[PDB]
Amino acid sequence: ALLDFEDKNGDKVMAGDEWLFEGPGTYIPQKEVEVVEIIQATVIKQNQALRLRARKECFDREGKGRVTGEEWLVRSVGAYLPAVFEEVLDLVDAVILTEKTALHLRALQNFRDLRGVLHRTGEEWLVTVQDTEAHVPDVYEEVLGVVPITTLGPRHYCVILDPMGPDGKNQLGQKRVVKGEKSFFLQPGERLERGIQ
Amino acid sequence: RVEVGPKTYIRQDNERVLFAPVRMVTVPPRHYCIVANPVSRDTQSSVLFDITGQVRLRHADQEIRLAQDPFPLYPGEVLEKDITPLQVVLPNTALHLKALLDFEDKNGDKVMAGDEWLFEGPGTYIPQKEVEVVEIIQATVIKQNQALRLRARKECFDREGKGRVTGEEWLVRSVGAYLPAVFEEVLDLVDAVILTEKTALHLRALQNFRDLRGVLHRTGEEWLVTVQDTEAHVPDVYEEVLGVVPITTLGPRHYCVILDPMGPDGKNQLGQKRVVKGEKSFFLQPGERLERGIQ
Amino acid sequence: ALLDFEDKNGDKVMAGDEWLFEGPGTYIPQKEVEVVEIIQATVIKQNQA
Structure with a gap:
């Protein structure tokens, strides 16, 4: 996103704001938003877990706090989509x-x-x-x-x-x-x- | 403008013929054709002539046809599919589908562009400008005392309907021929x-x-x-x-x-x-x- | 068969319907039905299956 344009939901959107549409369908292009990256959700077989570094201060799954450079395990079974800040490493x-x-x-x-x-x-x-x-x-x-x-x-x-x-x-x-x-x-x-x- | 009928219609002084006469676009019953730029029609399906002399046209929109009375090609239209045999479908196979642009379904069900679909069984499926006939899939055969692995390509409900997650996999109990669901991913008999x-x-x-x-x-x-x-x-x-x-x-x-x-x-x-x-x-x-x- | 044409018996005929005329005589061709295959009945001697 850029230049502080208004969102369709009426939410304010700062130029620095991260975003991530996902799921089935067809996303609508905007002169404002750039469709910067595609990201397939990582698959996770049972008895596996994924490392995730934080590229910025953030709340993760469960929502408990995080700091830059902090990293954590992914408990969730099955396919998992990384958040805008989340940085995938490998299954463990x-x-x-x-x-x-x-x-x-x-x-x-x-x-x-x-x-x-x-x-x-x-x-x-x-x-x-x-x-x-x-x-x-x-x-x-x-x-x-x-x-x-x-x-x-x-x-x-x-x-x-x-x-x-x-x-x-x-x-x-x-x-x-x-x-x-x-x-x-x-x-x-x-x-x-x-x-x- | 297009001209029609048996008459030897002489050109007027202001006008110029585009081409020598051509057979009307026609396809057999249980056959189909696709034409670009369909003309607009009302509830009576009457053609809506523009006052300036052009025929009305839906430019981005497409048109499909199975069978009816033989028809002239309207100006500004572009013929594409023609004389195409209707999409036959044997009982053991299926038709994976993707759909686009949130078009309404015949059943009145809403259809999202991301929706998966799978027609199957004996007959002849009807092509649509909306739905793409993306894949054919013959149902896997299963002899007695055999079972089939199935990975899930997305979150889903399987047979029996109990819940699933992406990357999860399960056995197929059922004896005899078995058709995979739109999400299901076949591996091998076990x-x-x-x-x-x-x-x-x-x-x-x-x-x-x-x-x-x-x-x-x-x-x-x-x-x-x-x-x-x-x-x-x-x-x-x-x-x-x-x-x-x-x-x-x-x-x-x-x-x-x-x-x-x-x-x-x-x-x-x-x-x-x-x-x-x-x-x-x-x-x-x-x-x-x-x-x-x-x- | 194709395109859901009506049968002579008044039975509905789906395009996917299978059919098999057999026995002595002369079958009547139709623009609808294709005469797809000929199939001689298998012989079976006693004590065979």
């Missing part, structure tokens, strides 16, 4: 959690998780099946890699350096053997010595 | 594995979904399907088959170790082995694996 497939597999997130910065557990910047944590059937990484959730399960029989055992404490911080320099029909993923920061015996 | 006592299906969930039998399956779960369930089972769009599972029936004098036996909880018990013996007859539970491989 969730890891399919299984009893033998575990996610290994690290926080890029401070943020609340989807389940309300606050995570301080630089913290590192597992995600397991008890949490979700699957978990899409968040824009601030930086995945490291898949964590193999270390289930073992009764006659096997393994040392584990720096076992996780009740405090949630690893106890530096201490080792802890574990034995029996154990079945658990390694806590972050932990590492085996001999590697199972 | 043959069911023919379950037998010696064979078992090995599904894994692409995502969360309820199964056909109402047992919810969380994303990434993996499960067998056996004869007690169905005579045969078509994989669902979210059901990713891995492969056929051979039965491991054995005689009384044979036995086999099995790592990580399935628990009551439905999760495999990691790191534990369990021998089984006697006239046993069972498929391996998912996640299980033999050690020695039968003894």
